[PDB]
Amino acid sequence: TRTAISRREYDEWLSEAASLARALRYPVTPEMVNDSAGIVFGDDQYEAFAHGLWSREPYEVMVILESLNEPAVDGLPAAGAAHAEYSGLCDKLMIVHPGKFCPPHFHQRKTESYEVVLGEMEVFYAPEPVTVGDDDVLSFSPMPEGSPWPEGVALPAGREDSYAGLTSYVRLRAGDPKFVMHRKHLHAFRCPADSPVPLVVREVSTYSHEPTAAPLPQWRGLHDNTFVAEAANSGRLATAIA
Amino acid sequence: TRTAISRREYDEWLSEAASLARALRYPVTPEMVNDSAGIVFGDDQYEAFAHGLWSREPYEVMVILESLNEPAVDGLPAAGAAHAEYSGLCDKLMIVHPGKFCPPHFHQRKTESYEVVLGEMEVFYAPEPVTVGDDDVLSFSPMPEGSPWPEGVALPAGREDSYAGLTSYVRLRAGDPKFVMHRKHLHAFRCPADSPVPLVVREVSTYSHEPAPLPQWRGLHDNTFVAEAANSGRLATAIA
Amino acid sequence: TRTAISRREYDEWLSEAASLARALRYPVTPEMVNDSAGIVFGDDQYEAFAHGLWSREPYEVMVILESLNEPAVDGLPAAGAAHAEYSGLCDKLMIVHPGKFCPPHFHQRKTESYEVVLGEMEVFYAPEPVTVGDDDVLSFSPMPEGSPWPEGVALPAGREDSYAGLTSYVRLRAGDPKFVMHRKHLHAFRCPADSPVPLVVREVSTYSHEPTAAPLPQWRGLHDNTFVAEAANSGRLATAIA
Amino acid sequence: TRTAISRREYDEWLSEAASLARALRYPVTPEMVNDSAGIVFGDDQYEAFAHGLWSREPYEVMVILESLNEPAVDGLPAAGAAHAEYSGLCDKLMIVHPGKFCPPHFHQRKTESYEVVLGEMEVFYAPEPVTVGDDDVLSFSPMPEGSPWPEGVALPAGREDSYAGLTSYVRLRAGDPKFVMHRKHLHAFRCPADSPVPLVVREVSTYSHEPAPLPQWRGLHDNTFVAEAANSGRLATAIA
Ligand SMILES: [Mn+2]
Ligand SMILES: [Mn+2]
Ligand SMILES: [Mn+2]
Ligand SMILES: [Mn+2]
């Protein structure tokens, strides 16, 4: 079983992703195409490269080209420092190949929005927010109920369990209105296995607290991504390239 | 002189803007093309239509197609309700014709970012922030100094002085890194007068307050223009 | 009734057309944006500008941005000079606003192909070729029969008669296979009146013999566009701008 | 050494090429993505896959996605049947990776035109036409002289000499005027070795004869490569 991605496999993956992104008019700078942009969620997912990104097999791997991750702390009243972490601005292009997924997880602080650029996006989520402490949270526009899962959702071997709570389904396409995924909601998505092209989606969200002189002292060592699956939640950061 | 835009002028202006937006893959739905998307900053700016959007003359008029304006209040701890207005997510596509401007102004709460999609964007701004309300504010990544203005910029007649404080300049093109304009910073921008195409820019910013997620958000004004006339021209577009 | 297009109307029309073309990646050079690119088929069609290109009213007006019109005579055996006029290469982008048409006509020498870039193209044609002299013409892939006209085809006032022979219908969209319109076939097309965008179509055809040191002596003064309507066939060239 | 391309390599090569084509708005239908769209010009060129399409090494391999290849015989006077083969309409999208080439060759009948869609195209050609068959040919707009080759062009190993006769050079970019390559002219092209993206070019040409509209068209060969090996690599792609 694969334990890493070869330099050739990785370079071709990111190069073709960056080329497709540019063709779609997403602003890609050299610095954005790095050894951290191609993500493998769990060591058991490197097996995705045994047959490759066009095998159409179910695995949790994807490319993220981040053009923006602005704290938006400047100008913020000091009195609001405690919750600045729920704000900020992040713009990234996500490229997911046929049959692949962005694994089940939720964010305590980050709210996201999706805009499909190419292909079709199958989003899976929990209409109800996870309970985070004895917090008295605000409400305004709760997540829509959505529809039940369609037929054809091949889940990654050994991870099917982590998708159990994501009962709601919505399929997004280019030209559709923006879709918002409120913070504290379990979610995941995949590119249909029969898709002729990789799924390309622009995500505009609040600040992304992920490992990679902090905006605020309290922001140091802050992880805002909690995955359901252990393999992904505990040990999914850096990408092993050999 | 012009006191309003004709129905035909408005329809062609927004129909072509929305068509260009769609060609550039921006998600445009019907409710986005409305009576307020074509903005004229002041009654004296309707004269921009005496010769049209391809006259290359300096006027402050533009189209904004907003695909998202999410409060992002859901899930936020009640304890942060007081400053939730500084957050949120807004996505809009701005179309500015040759020589036209988005006039000098600042936002107390909204921080923006620019991504040029078509054409080139000339940004004029003040690198030092203004103080709006609360004295003690946070700081992390101050606005860069950019460069001084280039020669030959044509400003709108009678609005020249309003640009005096925006001494820094940067010219953005497609493919460039995202440019951030922190809240409380005076800024403005134009499409070069000699541009072959209209300037098209995607703006990703915090919530856009335009007269509710929270009680205190009601009737909140977050756009302060330097020119008195420009403030007036932002309420409603006069379409004859 | 309108007798010409104002300089402002014309410049805005061509400028927005060239901008849209560039946005769609069609190579537009300054020389391609000229006073002949915006075409009005007949003096009775200038009325299209009484209410404008977004009035959605039926008129025969359009923009043609020609990036190529190559004789392809170079290297051709002298023995084939007699029929070089049926060859050549022409690449042009056609932009037609909601409800507007490219008027009924046929070409004796030019064969065309269509590739919709934006919007939807409603093509009207005669499945059978017009008879041009006692010619013994070649055959290989005759025009498909197509379907009958749909409901919603508002024809230009005073020209509805010229559309009578174009009995076959086909609706083209972006991503569809290339559609070929063989020479000697009456044809026309329009952008649906309810379209949210102007119809943008790339036409790749054989040489376009239209008024504007000839490739071949016999090519001088050669017109290959025969329109059904008199107003268009006799007096539709130059565009009157005032 | 490599004697064929692996199934996975071929699938990823064409799937990414077709995806890029679609993103660039080229009309790709299923029958266009086939076992002959990924071309390897010679058995010695399969080595291009030893390190891959992003190795930036000079090899003669490319993908061609043909959306149209119309004989244009319908309606043509029978009297012109003898030279109908010099006409017709072909539309194809060519994708060439960094440092890769479309090898030196000429067509007796096909005249082509290039429109760069993504990246930059370096064209090497002979401005003087070769004589193929008939002596008396027509002339109107001779190929321009272009410029001499720029410094540093890396050629495929063992194929260097085949480029000797293509002394003229032109570099084409997106938005440039269409470039015409008349029939009977030796030509070749590559994507710069340092290009950040694959070169994507739309070719509009007369009919592409590849082994019927007319009896005489059967088994017609209209591609003559300078390198003997390159001629061999054009028949069928070895996919293991
Ligand atoms: Mn997420
Ligand atoms: Mn602003
Ligand atoms: Mn025609
Ligand atoms: Mn060739």
Q: Is B23–C24 a contact, with Cβ atoms under 8 angstroms apart?
A: yes
How far is ligand 3, taken at its centre, from the CA of residue D133, in Å? 35
Return the domain boundaries, chain A: 1-242
Amino acid sitting at position C107: H
Hey, what are D83's tokens? 């030279």
Coil, helix or strand at residue C100: coil
Experimental resolution (Å): 1.9
How far is ligand 4, taken at its centre, from the CA of residue D220, in Å? 15
Q: Do B86 and B109 contact (CB within 8 A), yes or no?
A: yes
Nearest by CB: A54 against D12, D24, D198: D12
Contacts of D214 in chain C (CB under 8 A): 138, 140
Q: Is B54–C23 a contact, with Cβ atoms under 8 angstroms apart?
A: no
Backbone angles phi, psi at C14, to 5 degrees: -65, -35
CA distance linking residue A129 with residue A184, whole number of Å: 5
Which residue does chain C place closest to B54, by CA atoms? Answer: C12
Q: Roughly how many angstroms between the first and final C-alpha of chain D, as a whole number?
A: 14
Report the half-sphere exposure of C88 (CA within 13 A, side-chain side): 25
Q: Which residues contact C230 (CB under 8 A, 6 or more apart)?
A: none
DSSP symbols for B53-90 = TTS-----EEEEEEEEEE---TT-BGGGGGGGGG--EE
Burial of D30 (C-beta count, 10 Å sphere; 0-12/13-18/19+):
exposed
Give me the helices (H) in chain B, please: 7-23, 48-51, 228-232
CA distance linking residue C115 with residue C181, whole number of Å: 12
D112 is in an annotated binding site: yes
Q: Which residues contact B236 (CB under 8 A, 6 or more apart)?
A: B35, B36
Which chains neighbour A (Cβ–Cβ under 8 Å, 3 or more pairs)?
B, D
Hey, what are D163's tokens? 């480029």
∠ at Cα A208 (A206, A212), nearest 5°?
160
Backbone angles phi, psi at B31, to 5 degrees: -65, -15
- Quote the distance between the C-alpha of residue C143 and its chain's center: 18
Nearest to C76 by CA among C224, C216, C205, C218: C216
Residue of B24, B25, B197, B199 best to disrupt the C interface, most CBs of C under 10 A: B197
Contacts of B55 in chain C (CB under 8 A): 8
Q: Which residues contact C42 (CB under 8 A, 6 or more apart)?
A: C60, C103, C159, C229, C231, C232, C235, C236
In sequence order, the β-bridge partners of residue B94 are B64, B201
Max CA distance (Å), chain C: 53
Hey, what are D23's tokens? 């993103």
Q: Give B187-214 as a 3 state SS string.
A: EEEEECCCCCCCEEEEEEECCCCCCCCC
User: For residues B29, B223, A141 and A177, what is the CA-based torsion angle, rounded to 10 degrees?
Assistant: 20
The closest ligand to the CA of B203 turns out to be 2
Q: Are strands C199-205 and C89-96 parallel, antiparallel or unpaired?
A: antiparallel
In sequence order, the β-bridge partners of residue A69 are A90
Amino acid sitting at position C189: F
Q: Which residues contact D48 (CB under 8 A, 6 or more apart)?
A: D2, D40, D55, D57, D59, D60, D61, D100
Hey, what CATH class is C1-242 in?
Answer: mainly beta
- The whole-angstrom distance between C96's CA and the closest CA on chain B is 13
Hey, what are C241's tokens? 């701008």
Going from the C-alpha of B170 to that of each of B58, B146, D193, the distances in angstroms are 19, 6, 32
Give kind and range of the element (H or E) at residue C18: helix C7-23
Residue of B65, B74, B85, B218 best to disrupt the A interface, most CBs of A under 10 A: B74
Considering only CB atoms, which residues of chain A are within 8 Å of chain D? 8, 11-12, 15-16, 18-20, 22-24, 30, 51-55, 118, 196-198, 200
∠ at Cα C233 (C228, C237), nearest 5°?
145
Q: Is D16–A11 a contact, with Cβ atoms under 8 angstroms apart?
A: no
- The whole-angstrom distance between B122's CA and the closest CA on chain C is 19
How far is ligand 1, taken at its centre, from the CA of residue D15, in Å? 28
Which residue does chain C place closest to D32, by CA atoms? Answer: C177
Nearest to A40 by CA among A127, A100, A84: A100
Q: Do C190 and C70 contact (CB within 8 A), yes or no?
A: no
Q: Give chain D as a 3 state SS string.
A: CCCCECHHHHHHHHHHHHHHHHHCCCCCCHHHCCCCCEEECCHHHCCHHHHCCCCCCCCCEEEEEEEEEECCCCCCEHHHHHHHHHCCEEEEEEEECECCEEEEEECCCCCEEEEEEECEEEEEECCCCCCCCCCCECCCCCCCCCECCCCCCCCCCCCHHHHCCCCEEEEEECCCCCEEECCCCCEEEEECCCCCCCEEEEEEECCCCCCCCCHHHCCCCCCEECCHHHHHCCCCCCEC
Coil, helix or strand at residue B114: strand
Q: Listing from the earlier edge strand, what are the strands of the sheet with B112-118?
A: B38-40, B61-70, B89-96, B199-205, B112-118, B179-181
CA distance linking residue B59 with residue B100, whole number of Å: 5
User: For residues D98, D101, D102 and D104, what is the CA-based torsion angle, rounded to 10 degrees?
Assistant: 160
Hey, what are C141's tokens? 């892939």
- Tell me the fold of D1-240: Jelly Rolls (2.60.120)
Contacts of C82 in chain D (CB under 8 A): 79-80
Coil, helix or strand at residue C12: helix
In sequence order, the β-bridge partners of residue D40 are D61
Q: Roughly how many angstroms between the first and final C-alpha of chain A, as a whole number?
A: 15
CA distance linking residue B109 with residue B118, whole number of Å: 28
Nearest by CB: D19 against A12, A52, A197: A197
Amino acid sitting at position A177: P
Q: Roughly how many angstroms between the first and final C-alpha of chain B, as a whole number?
A: 14
Q: Do C103 and C188 contact (CB within 8 A), yes or no?
A: yes
Residue of B137, B182, B207 best to disrupt the A interface, most CBs of A under 10 A: B137
Hey, what are A135's tokens? 């917090």
∠ at Cα D155 (D151, D160), nearest 5°?
110
Going from the C-alpha of D18 to that of each of A121, A199, D37, D62, D92, the distances in angstroms are 19, 14, 10, 12, 12
Angular region, A235: left φ>0, alpha ψ -120 to 50, beta rest: left
Q: Do D177 and D113 contact (CB within 8 A), yes or no?
A: no
Q: Give chain A as a 3 state SS string.
A: CCCCECHHHHHHHHHHHHHHHHHCCCCCCHHHCCCCCEEECCHHHCCHHHHCCCCCCCCCEEEEEEEEEECCCCCCEHHHHHHHHHCCEEEEEEEECECCEEEEEECCCCCEEEEEEECEEEEEECCCCCCCCCCCECCCCCCCCCECCCCCCCCCCCCHHHHCCCCEEEEEECCCCCEEECCCCCEEEEECCCCCCCEEEEEEECCCCCCCCCCCHHHCCCCCCEECCHHHHCCCCCCCEC
Coil, helix or strand at residue C190: strand
- Quote the distance between the C-alpha of residue D211 and its chain's center: 16
Number of Cβ within 10 Å of residue C34's Cβ equals 13
CA distance linking residue B138 with residue B141, whole number of Å: 10
Rounded to the nearest 10 degrees, the angle between the axes of helix B7-23 and helix C7-23 is 20
Considering only CB atoms, which residues of chain B are within 8 Å of chain C? 8, 11-12, 15-16, 18-20, 22-24, 51-55, 118, 196-198, 200
Amino acid sitting at position B96: V
A182 is in an annotated binding site: no
Which residue does chain A place closest to B129, by CA atoms? Answer: A75
How far is ligand 3, taken at its centre, from the CA of residue C107, in Å? 6
Nearest by CB: A25 against B25, B70, B213: B25
Amino acid sitting at position A239: T
Question: What does DSSP assign to residue C20?
Answer: H
Q: Is D73–C206 a contact, with Cβ atoms under 8 angstroms apart?
A: no
Give kind and range of the element (H or E) at residue C121: strand C120-125
Q: Do C142 and D82 contact (CB within 8 A), yes or no?
A: no
User: For residues A119, A120, A125 and A127, what is the CA-based torsion angle, rounded to 10 degrees?
Assistant: 130
Going from the C-alpha of A47 to that of each of A3, A53, D173, the distances in angstroms are 7, 11, 40
Q: Is D182–C75 a contact, with Cβ atoms under 8 angstroms apart?
A: yes
CA distance linking residue A58 with residue A48, whole number of Å: 8
DSSP symbols for C149-180 = --S---PPTTTGGGGTT--EEEEEETTSPPEE
Going from the C-alpha of D184 to that of each of C79, C116, D231, the distances in angstroms are 16, 32, 16
CA distance linking residue D166 with residue C73, whole number of Å: 22
CA dihedral over C34, C38, C41, C47, signed as positive or negative: negative
How far is ligand 3, taken at its centre, from the CA of residue A62, in Å? 47
- Quote the distance between the C-alpha of residue B94 and its chain's center: 7
